[PDB]
């Protein structure tokens, strides 16, 4: 479909995105093998 059946703006998707962004910020601020 033209993205017709997406479930925008409900409960835990925003929380998952926020948690992923926070984990990425923590990982990128603590760099200063595992990562290429």
């Amino acid at each position: 479909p033209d993205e017709k059946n997406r479930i925008t703006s409900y409960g835990f998707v925003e929380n998952d995105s926020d948690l992923v962004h926070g984990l990425l910020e923590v990982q990128g601020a603590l760099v200063g093998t595992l990562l290429f």
Binding site: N5, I7, F12, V13, D16
Partner: protein, 53 residues
């Protein structure tokens, strides 16, 4: 005290009773819950999972 008694004692504490009971009507949120719970169980085996509904 069996494990089902503990499970039912936990469910009465971490769940809110509600009148006018309704369920999800477009599945795909269920797929999101299923995939997230599976990835939580297999990868992070030191954290519990609240029952899916």
């Amino acid at each position: 005290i069996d494990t089902n008694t503990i499970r039912s004692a936990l469910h009465r504490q971490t769940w809110d009773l509600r009148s006018q009971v309704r369920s999800v009507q477009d599945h795909g949120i269920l797929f999101y819950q299923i995939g997230r719970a599976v990835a939580q169980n297999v990868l992070i085996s030191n954290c519990p999972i609240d029952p899916i509904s």
